[PDB]
Amino acid sequence: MQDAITSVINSSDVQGKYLDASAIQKLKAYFATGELRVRAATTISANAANIVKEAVAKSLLYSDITRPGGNMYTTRRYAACIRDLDYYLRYATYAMLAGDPSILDERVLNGLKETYNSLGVPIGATVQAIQAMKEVTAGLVGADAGKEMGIYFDYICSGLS
Amino acid sequence: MQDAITSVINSSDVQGKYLDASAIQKLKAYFATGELRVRAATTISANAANIVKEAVAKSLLYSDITRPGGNMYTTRRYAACIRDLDYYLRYATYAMLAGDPSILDERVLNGLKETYNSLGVPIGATVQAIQAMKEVTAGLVGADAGKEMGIYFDYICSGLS
Amino acid sequence: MQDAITSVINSSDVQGKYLDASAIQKLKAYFATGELRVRAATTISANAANIVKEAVAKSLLYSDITRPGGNMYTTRRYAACIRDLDYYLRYATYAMLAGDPSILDERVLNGLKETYNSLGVPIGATVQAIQAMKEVTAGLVGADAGKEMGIYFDYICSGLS
Amino acid sequence: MQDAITSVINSSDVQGKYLDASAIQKLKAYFATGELRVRAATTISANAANIVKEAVAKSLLYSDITRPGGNMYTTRRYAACIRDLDYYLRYATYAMLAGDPSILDERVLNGLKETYNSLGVPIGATVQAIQAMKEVTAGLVGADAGKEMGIYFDYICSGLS
Amino acid sequence: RFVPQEKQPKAGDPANFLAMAKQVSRPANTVTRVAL
Amino acid sequence: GGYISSKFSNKGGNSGASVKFSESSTQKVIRAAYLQVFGRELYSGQRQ
Amino acid sequence: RSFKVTACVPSQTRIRTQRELQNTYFTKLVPYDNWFREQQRIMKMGGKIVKVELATGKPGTNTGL
Amino acid sequence: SIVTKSIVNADAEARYLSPGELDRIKSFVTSGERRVRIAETMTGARERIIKEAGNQLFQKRPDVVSPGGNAYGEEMTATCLRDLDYYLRLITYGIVAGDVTPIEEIGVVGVREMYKSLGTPIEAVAEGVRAMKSVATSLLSGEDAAEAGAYFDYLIGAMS
Amino acid sequence: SIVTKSIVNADAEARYLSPGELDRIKSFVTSGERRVRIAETMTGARERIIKEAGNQLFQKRPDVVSPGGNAYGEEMTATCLRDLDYYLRLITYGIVAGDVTPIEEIGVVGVREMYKSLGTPIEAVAEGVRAMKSVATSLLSGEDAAEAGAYFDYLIGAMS
Amino acid sequence: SIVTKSIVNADAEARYLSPGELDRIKSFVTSGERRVRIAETMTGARERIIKEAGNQLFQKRPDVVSPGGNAYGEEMTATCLRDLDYYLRLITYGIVAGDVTPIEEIGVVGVREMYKSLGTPIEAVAEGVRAMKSVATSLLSGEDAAEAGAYFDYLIGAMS
Amino acid sequence: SIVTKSIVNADAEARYLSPGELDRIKSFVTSGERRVRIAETMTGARERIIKEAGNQLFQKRPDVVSPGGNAYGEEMTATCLRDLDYYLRLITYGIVAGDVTPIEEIGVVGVREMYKSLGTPIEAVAEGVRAMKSVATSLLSGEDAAEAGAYFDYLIGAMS
Amino acid sequence: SIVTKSIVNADAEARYLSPGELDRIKSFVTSGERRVRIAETMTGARERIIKEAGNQLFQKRPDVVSPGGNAYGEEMTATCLRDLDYYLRLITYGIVAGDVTPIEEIGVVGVREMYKSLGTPIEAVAEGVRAMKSVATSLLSGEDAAEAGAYFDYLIGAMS
């Protein structure tokens, strides 16, 4: 947990100095975009069963994966796969609300890269489902905030790949 | 591959009309600022190795990726990186005379986004380096041409991030 | 790349049997209609330019597809309209001589759903171009083999759409 | 392509520690049983065109799979699957000397799953062929090294099924 | 001039030449062998 | 069998494949590749 | 150390009467040491690089290639 | 353009721009206000150039306006001028760029397949775009009729 | 088929089919029934053409029947009949198509790497199938054994 | 020899010789006394090897003595025992040279097309080298049979 | 390693690894209990090898210690021992590997670039490395430095 | 001819001839006794053709012989009738080859670049050939109409 407020607190505290001008230009940029991020976090939570549906109905249904043989054939694999895609979207909105990907470094990308190769999960399909979930979310919230999730959606894809 | 004269041609062709008065106001605007773009092309290509040997010195030379555990100890990986940051200086100066960011798109930005995710290297250290390249190149060529080269550095920076 | 001659070789091989009497009359079923395909393939090859002008004249030449901003606007693209329409005519008469649509799936309908998407070619326009090409070659051949020619054109249009 | 010697070299430089005491008994475990491997790998090359004599003749030769209608019935599909079994023996013997299955997933297991589901190759026939060729090597190298060769044989069958 | 390189003496290894005459039967008849 | 990687969603390969025509059309590219780079037909113990 | 590209390139100046479907959809495997002289060849042709994949081993492994 | 040609030639040798080539771009940019007023000499008088070469084409070749020919009727004639209206737009792009590179990618690389498919004779177009040349250089100045006319004469020989 | 060889002969140069080549197809249709009469004479007289000509191969080459060789009397000479029966099946596939490629893609393309791994002399198969088609030409006629004669000799020149 | 693999596989990268490959040079000139004693003993009983391993080969594969085969009569079996003496001589070159390459160039790279043009079976000589290594490793010492028996093992393993 | 270089060479010939090279892996594994004493001796003197070879280098090239070279000052002579220690942290990765495959990919492949990119001449870097591998040869035995000193002196010709 | 490119298609694969195209050579040589009968009819009435194909051309495009045109003059038509007389020589070469490569190697390849240089319009010489096609097919019967008009088609579609 490091907010973009608290990130420049900690980078100023390791030097032990006060807030300079270029540190405040990170705050006053972040204080400017406050109302934009709050409008996005409402309309995702009102659509969080539909963003997780139109991502998988675009990219993963009727594919190799929903067919018998690989990784989403049984229902318990399907319930576990929609449990991940719900949890990626719920953890992406915190970095949209913070403005820092330190949530994704601490709470998501710790054990996830190791446990997918250890389970036989295709990384190359679930790096595509979050990639398919971006342009649903960039259309659902408006492209001004659609260019805000793209840092933190693909911070998962930079880590998970 | 296009330039700012033919992009005005292409933006008038795909719209349909001839060289209207909005385009000539755009095209004469290129010919005024085109004099300073040549005089800042030579002083970059003079000090092309001198920029990149100092832009690595602001951000990369004593960090996580010099103590063992990161991208560059393996001598091929550091020497690719100085060579990658060399090619950002070539293509931005190709973008400076051509007057458009689209030369950076069909030469740099389309391929490079998915390799750096796949090869596990950080994009966040790259965009920290090009922003460190922005603050030394404005000191060499002068500030008024630094606003010109600050455009195409940011198009790499926003494109990679 | 299976012919209707080779299709009854393909079925009799995997049975492990010789030239069966059921396979004899099936070959004679192709041999009976083989006179009506050689006499119709000469008419298509003598009218390939005399068909593809009249397929674009019914559905293509005056719309928002040959305006500036249209997909086949410039003559770099308009020559790649006719030639990419000529493959659908030249391979139509190829399966007419074979009596088997397996040639279309291996040579033609192979990546064309994916290729036209990543160029920007609208698939909803060229599906009508094939159907306009079907109604002009029905009068040039006759209702005997124009029934037989017409089952390949929607077969192209099935996997293309 | 890298062996167990380079792997403990790979896991020692990257954390900033020298060649410590705990890396030596990983190498001394290699240097103890490495004399066994040169006695093993020579005798496989004595029978490298004789294991494939027994490969068809135990589980494939006088079966219904070779009977016209099955998968292994063509001369272009016969001889393509003796070389496809001979490569699985030769790359096993590289791993027999590597102490590591990290020559298999670079050169053997890279595209081997999808090329058998697409080409109509039954997976169960190969693992009834590869695991049948584990025990004939157990009569040629002795008891212990065939159990070492059974690791990489099962690493094929874990990476094929 | 007539030698240079020849080990003429086959001598002992030969010979058998018992020989045999072989009959003809149908290929289809499962002589070929069908596992499973 | 066609281009197996990069899935290419519709392919009518006829994976049973008693007789394809495609095996001769890919055998004589391979023989012509040996016939240009080496310039001759290679010996049978040497062709990789 | 092979990659796995997939590349969409158009025909720039010529109108090829043969099919050349494969000449617009190179989805080949290129090794690492010669990808970057090869990547600029698609890039100067005006092609589009769609995806690249590590078909070979792990990134960050500094030995054994 | 000269900017586009000097980059792509210098990118292939992996070099920066030569000082002989940087002064080529420097004179090309500063003379860009000369070339844009040659472009507006034609687009200011475009509707006269079409109409005079409209009368000059059908005089020297009347079979295309004749019944049976491919421009017969008040809508089927309207198109052939509108096709000549495209080539005023193309050559005005060429004078501005200082090269025939927008003539290439827009206008001339597929005409030997298009009009053969469309049935119109290419040599019928090749004189109508040549009658465009005689009505243009009478309206221009002395020196730029070699400058703009090179983009005209490029469109003749690449047509026929 | 001779239809199938004709398209790929025209598709390599990206061409519609020549009317001289459709004469070969139109002659193939009116002579299509004659080749079915050729093929039934082989399948009807299969049990006299295999046991005889294999015995001609064993009289020409008595190396085959003797132990130490590839065959042996109880089933190995019997399974060299069914490995010889496959080629007569492939000729009848080839003559009704008017083409070489049903002989090719089933039983030519990898026979050298097969029979080296199987341990038979591939040349003895070629002398055996030469003994097979010596009596096959004397079976049916003298007229029909010439254009079916052109598909007999190819498999001789494919093994060696 | 040992240098001939190393002087080519480092010339192709245009570098000097890596000291791992200088172990390979060092690795033997200490074995060159041990590599020379074994080929002196192999040549010194080269008449007993061919007369014994040629003898019981025909008890294992009696087909090539039998009529219909190639080596019918003593005038061809003594011609057949030339290739046994040639391959015994090519063993003794490869032990002294130190590795795989001189027996590969002189007696291997045409033997699928030499022996096919002679009509002889390519598998039966591969049976004889396993008996040629049976009588040789039966007469030499125990410590060199892991060295000198393995140079036999290459010309087995690339013959069949 | 020497295991790794042999198997990639045998993949290029598409055969099994040769009995000439199988001596070397067998010679590597009986010297695998010979290589480990070189590795542990460099642990006990890595604070002694580097701290002497710096002053051996600075008496050979004192241009570095002068104000203006790339290591001037106490913060700048840190790396001119640390990059030397990093090369002592490369030989013990490849003493027990036997050869240069961890020497290249960590040390050699772009070393003409980055010392030019940092401004340090590699001829001074190779001099202290040569000054290092005189002291390490004197510290080890006469048999140890006979082969490891040949392995030491690869890097000087590889760097410059 | 068919035989001279069935060689080259079989030579570049280094194969012998397949029996599918040996049918194509054998059907060609028994068609040789009737194709030269077409060519003897064509050269027997060349002056009936060339005089009539001139007058069917010059009525259609009267601008080329009216002065201001390229073929103006008493003798300039006599070369331009001779320049159309050459295509009657080549079509009789193309009839007896059964092919179109003697049309191609002699009268196609640089025919755009000659008449661009000499100044005659390239479609105006193509309209003489279809005027020559209408009279030469009227010389013959029905079964020689398509066999002669196919090579007339190829010379039209190449020049236009």
Ligand SMILES: *[C@H](C)[C@H]1/C(=C/c2[nH]c(/C=C3N=C(/C=C4\NC(=O)C(CC)=C4C)C(C)=C\3CCC(=O)O)c(CCC(=O)O)c2C)NC(=O)[C@@H]1C
């Ligand atoms: C979905 C389209 C892809 C996919 C999903 C899948 N995952 C599992 C199993 C697990 N997933 C997790 C995920 C997380 N742990 C975290 O802490 C976070 C951050 C919030 C995430 C996203 C874990 C821990 C497991 C294992 C434990 C469990 O019981 O779920 C499965 C089940 C695998 C199985 O064999 O049952 C599936 C199917 N897999 C695919 O095929 C798609 C590519």
Ligand SMILES: CCC1=C(C)/C(=C/C2=NC(=C\c3[nH]c(/C=C4\NC(=O)[C@H](C)[C@H]4CC)c(C)c3CCC(=O)O)/C(CCC(=O)O)=C2C)NC1=O
């Ligand atoms: C062996 C266990 C198993 C189950 C349970 C299973 C369910 C399953 N049903 C699916 C779709 C579906 N299933 C249904 C079925 C129904 N809806 C209705 O209205 C019908 C009354 C009802 C039938 C009970 C429909 C309509 C879809 C398609 C949904 C869509 O495309 O939006 C899909 C997505 C496509 C795919 O990848 O397969 C899965 C995975 N698959 C399995 O392999």
Ligand SMILES: CCC1=C(C)/C(=C/C2=NC(=C\c3[nH]c(/C=C4\NC(=O)[C@H](C)[C@H]4CC)c(C)c3CCC(=O)O)/C(CCC(=O)O)=C2C)NC1=O
């Ligand atoms: C294990 C593989 C490895 C290699 C090859 C390597 C090279 C290397 N040397 C460096 C610096 C350096 N290396 C030196 C060393 C020298 N310069 C001198 O003048 C001395 C004469 C000479 C030693 C012989 C110094 C002084 C620097 C820092 C340069 C500076 O700060 O300007 C740096 C940048 C700082 C860092 O992150 O370490 C790298 C990457 N580092 C590695 O980890």
Ligand SMILES: CCC1=C(C)/C(=C/C2=NC(=C\c3[nH]c(/C=C4\NC(=O)[C@H](C)[C@H]4CC)c(C)c3CCC(=O)O)/C(CCC(=O)O)=C2C)NC1=O
């Ligand atoms: C002209 C358009 C273009 C770009 C921009 C480009 C990038 C590119 N960067 C690469 C490697 C690399 N690049 C880096 C980069 C860095 N190391 C760091 O610590 C920093 C974050 C960063 C630079 C200072 C590293 C560590 C590698 C090696 C990773 C690998 O082996 O894949 C490679 C693989 C080999 C090569 O260098 O040619 C390519 C192709 N290629 C292109 O064609």
Ligand SMILES: CCC1=C(C)/C(=C/C2=NC(=C\c3[nH]c(/C=C4\NC(=O)[C@H](C)[C@H]4CC)c(C)c3CCC(=O)O)/C(CCC(=O)O)=C2C)NC1=O
């Ligand atoms: C070096 C690592 C490596 C392996 C292992 C490999 C296998 C491999 N097997 C293939 C085909 C094949 N594989 C088989 C396999 C078998 N047939 C049977 O009877 C059994 C089920 C199985 C016994 C092994 C068959 C029949 C084909 C050809 C498909 C066809 O007949 O069209 C192909 C497609 C190309 C071809 O051979 O035509 C590859 C690439 N390739 C590699 O690069």
Ligand SMILES: CCC1=C(C)/C(=C/C2=NC(=C\c3[nH]c(/C=C4\NC(=O)[C@H](C)[C@H]4CC)c(C)c3CCC(=O)O)/C(CCC(=O)O)=C2C)NC1=O
């Ligand atoms: C044999 C199977 C097969 C076909 C048919 C095929 C077609 C194909 N059509 C293409 C382009 C094109 N195709 C069109 C198509 C059209 N224009 C329209 O407006 C209509 C919607 C449609 C035709 C009726 C256009 C405008 C282009 C140029 C745009 C591009 O570069 O993709 C290209 C790109 C290269 C080029 O021509 O420059 C290919 C390869 N490829 C194949 O492998």
Ligand SMILES: CCC1=C(C)/C(=C/C2=NC(=C\c3[nH]c(/C=C4\NC(=O)[C@H](C)[C@H]4CC)c(C)c3CCC(=O)O)/C(CCC(=O)O)=C2C)NC1=O
């Ligand atoms: C900018 C590049 C460009 C070119 C070259 C171009 C040509 C072009 N000319 C067309 C038609 C035509 N073009 C003409 C023009 C002519 N025919 C004649 O007889 C005159 C001699 C001649 C003019 C010199 C006419 C009459 C038609 C309509 C023919 C028809 O509909 O059958 C069409 C089809 C309908 C349309 O205009 O959308 C195209 C695409 N379009 C382009 O975008």
Ligand SMILES: CCC1=C(C)/C(=C/C2=NC(=C\c3[nH]c(/C=C4\NC(=O)[C@H](C)[C@H]4CC)c(C)c3CCC(=O)O)/C(CCC(=O)O)=C2C)NC1=O
């Ligand atoms: C149509 C394409 C095609 C061919 C050609 C084919 C051949 C073929 N020949 C075989 C065996 C055999 N073939 C022979 C043949 C011979 N030995 C001799 O002495 C004679 C010289 C010679 C033939 C005249 C023998 C002895 C076997 C059994 C080998 C064994 O069981 O070890 C086998 C293994 C057993 C079987 O399933 O019948 C196959 C698959 N399969 C095919 O799908």
Ligand SMILES: CCC1=C(C)/C(=C/C2=NC(=C\c3[nH]c(/C=C4\NC(=O)[C@H](C)[C@H]4CC)c(C)c3CCC(=O)O)/C(CCC(=O)O)=C2C)NC1=O
């Ligand atoms: C330097 C590499 C090399 C070797 C080894 C070699 C052998 C060789 N074998 C020959 C013949 C032959 N060699 C054999 C030998 C055999 N056939 C069998 O069945 C057995 C498997 C084997 C002996 C046991 C036979 C039978 C002939 C005579 C072939 C014939 O008469 O058609 C001949 C021609 C006869 C002569 O010159 O005296 C040579 C030169 N030639 C070479 O260039």
Ligand SMILES: CCC1=C(C)/C(=C/C2=NC(=C\c3[nH]c(/C=C4\NC(=O)[C@H](C)[C@H]4CC)c(C)c3CCC(=O)O)/C(CCC(=O)O)=C2C)NC1=O
């Ligand atoms: C067999 C291959 C072949 C070709 C193609 C060929 C063409 C040919 N046509 C020529 C002249 C000519 N050709 C024409 C032809 C015409 N004027 C028209 O208006 C009509 C369109 C057209 C013919 C119907 C004219 C007028 C000249 C004289 C050009 C001049 O003297 O300026 C000449 C120059 C005179 C000479 O060298 O004899 C050549 C070489 N000669 C050959 O041997």
